Amino acid sequence: IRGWIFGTTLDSKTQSLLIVNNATNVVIKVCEFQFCNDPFLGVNCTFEYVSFKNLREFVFKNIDGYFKIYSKHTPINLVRGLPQGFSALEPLVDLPIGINITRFQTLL
């Protein structure tokens, strides 16, 4: 898993947000995009930003035109599903994206 897309129509006549994770970099972008019918990662611009054995956890929420990201990392044993235990996610970013959101999709 290496990115996400969020929006109302997700492409075409409305704005949407893209996130991509790129080995050492991260890229975040907003546009009236026209992505693929079946998106991929491997071998306009009205906002832009740049920077089993493990479980990565995230929360995405949109409030007052800001988009808030929280995250956590942990090692794990359980192969089947989310492990019984406890840790709390901590804030990464609070982005002034302004768009409306209704749908999302994972990139992998």
Binding site: K13, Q15, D64, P96, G98, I99, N100
Partner: peptide
């Protein structure tokens, strides 16, 4: 609009 919502769409 929701607070600080931005929308540039130009549909009929």
């Amino acid at each position: 609009l929701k607070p600080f919502e931005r929308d540039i769409s130009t549909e009929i």
